Every structure is written in C-alpha cells, then in structure tokens.
Amino acid sequence: TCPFYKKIPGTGFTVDAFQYGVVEGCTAYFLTHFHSDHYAGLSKHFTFPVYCSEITGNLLKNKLHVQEQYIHPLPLDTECIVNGVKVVLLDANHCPGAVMILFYLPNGTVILHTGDFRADPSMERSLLADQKVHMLYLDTTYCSPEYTFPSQQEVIRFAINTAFEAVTLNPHALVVCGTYSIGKEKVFLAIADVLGSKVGMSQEKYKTLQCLNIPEINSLITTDMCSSLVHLLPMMQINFKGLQSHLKKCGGKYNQILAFRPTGWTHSNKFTRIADVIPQTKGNISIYGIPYSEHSSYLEMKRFVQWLKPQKIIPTVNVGTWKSRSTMEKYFREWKLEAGY
Ligand code: NI
What we know:
Blueprint: E1 7-8, E2 13-15, E3 28-30, H1 36-39, E4 50-53, H2 54-62, E5 71-74, E6 80-82, E7 85-91, E8 99-104, E9 110-113, E10 135-138, H3 152-169, E11 173-179, H4 185-194, E12 199-200, H5 203-210, E13 221-222, E14 230-234, H6 240-249, E15 256-263, E16 280-282, E17 285-291, H7 298-308, E18 312-315, H8 322-339
Parallel strand pairs: 2-3, 3-4, 4-5, 9-10, 10-18, 11-14, 11-15, 12-13, 12-14, 15-17
Antiparallel strand pairs: 1-2, 6-7, 7-8, 8-9, 16-17
Helix pairs in contact: 3-4
The structure holds nickel (II) ion.
The site of nickel (II) ion (NI) has 4 residues, from loops.
C-alpha cells in the first residue's frame, strides 16, 4: 500500500504514487519527472488528474499515451492553485522536465518535495528564499560521506577532449553513448557539437528527444546513422559483444568505437580523479565509464539542507532497510548540530 512518504498531509495529494491503484483519499496525483520507478503504473487507462511540468506532460501524452483530458501541465516558478491549495514547481537540476514541488497548506505549513534533484547554490535564490519551509521530502540517493563526484562541467570537459582527440587521430572512429531513460543528454550533445556532427539514434529515441523543448533540436539530431559520427544505443548494448555487432551493422564505414557509459557513482571515485580515468579495451573498441551524476553528492545535499533549515526531514530513497534509515537520521542530526537550527 502507498507509503507515507508519498503522501502530502492535509491535502488530497500524492507524489510519484501510480503503482498502488486508486489511493484512498487522493484527488490529484503529482508526477515529479518521467523516470520509470516514479511513473510506474501510469498508462493510457489512467483516469485521474496528473499534475506535472510541460515537458513531462509531452512525454505522458506521446510516450505513454495518457489521454489529454487527465494531463495538467504547470509552468515553472509560478504561483498556481490546485484544488484550492497554492503550489509552485521549481527546476530540480535532474533530467529534462524534472521538478521540485512547494505546497502551501491552509493551516500555514510549507512543504518542499524535492523529487529527484541535484542540489545547487543557485536554488538558494529561487522562490524558496522567500519564506520558511517546515517539512522536506528529500532525495537521499547518495546520503553518505563517501559519495563525492566531480561537477557536471568537469566531466563534460573530459568527455569532449577525449572524443575530439580520438576522432582527430582517426577520422574513421565512431563515438557511442549509452542511454536507457531521459537524462544526461548534455553528454552526447556536447560531444556532437565539438565534432561538428548531429547525433544518430533510433526512431523511438528521436521521438523522446522531440518532447523535451530543446531549442534548435532538429539541427542537432538524426535517424540517419550513416550521416552521423556520434551514435546513441541502449546501455544494455554498451559492451564488446553489443558494440562489435553494431560496428558490423555500419557497413564498413568505421574502424574504431570510442564509447561512454555515463554511470552515477562507482567505487573508483574514492581513489582516482577525473583527469586520471582509463577505459576497457578489447581490440579496436574502447569503453569509458564516466561519473556523470544527476543526483546530489553528500556535500551538495548537506549544504542545501543546512541553508533551508527544515523542522522535519522525510527521506524518499534508501528507506527499505533499518540500517539505511538509521544512518540517514544520524547524518541529519549532525547537520542540524553543526549549523544550529
Ligand atoms: Ni530519477
């Protein structure tokens, strides 16, 4: 049954709770972003209102075939009223169309649900600055001090230089980028831009990207694999067997694949730096795993929470074990101690 951490008290609202059936008491279902563990159970047969960003609305309509009459897109950074309750959507710095939700309760309580987010100093100058927040429903994916990773910009710089060098040395080398959901488009689009290419992909992935309000997107992407020296593939196909096969499909037009797997965290981040990474090479194919995160590092998360000063924190990730829960609660007490709220 629907967990408490997906319910907004003193409203008829749930958040990312589509896989429980009809939740008793729910008049409006919010969807923070289009990732499968969060929309799980939405379909063309869903008959209750869905509140979400314009981009997430494009994806529900065009990918899941949800009927238009149930989709309520809201603009960002705008005071909106939903079934009598003031709400605001804020950019979550996660994947395209991902939002955080501010709920202003009739009683005067203010609630922030982060969805999935990568906390950033810039959030300290949004509409969150303008009043007290009592409760925080927090993306705790990497809530442990060992999770350090570099800035997105650093990782993108590394990827652009590596690709450029390899292709300049061998103009018949192909770049491949793995994907499985929306998110991490900056990795492949930055690589393509530096190489003066469009990105080649399947028709299904092409449609997906057409939903994202990316400016000039038609000048950036393509289905024509032949006219394209950055390609996208399923992450499931980013391995030697899967790459070889794909190299065989290109019709003797490339003699070398440089591929990137954008992974969240791996235990090689507790030792090695970004400058000091290496690939896994079997022949003319080489696969790099790069630590491109769309969730908060430990330190990013800690700074955000210390700034916001919430009275209560409810974790939304890593909640299924007692050890995880207990460990998160300890970090939250230390943060409040070190800062004095
Ligand atoms: Ni997500």
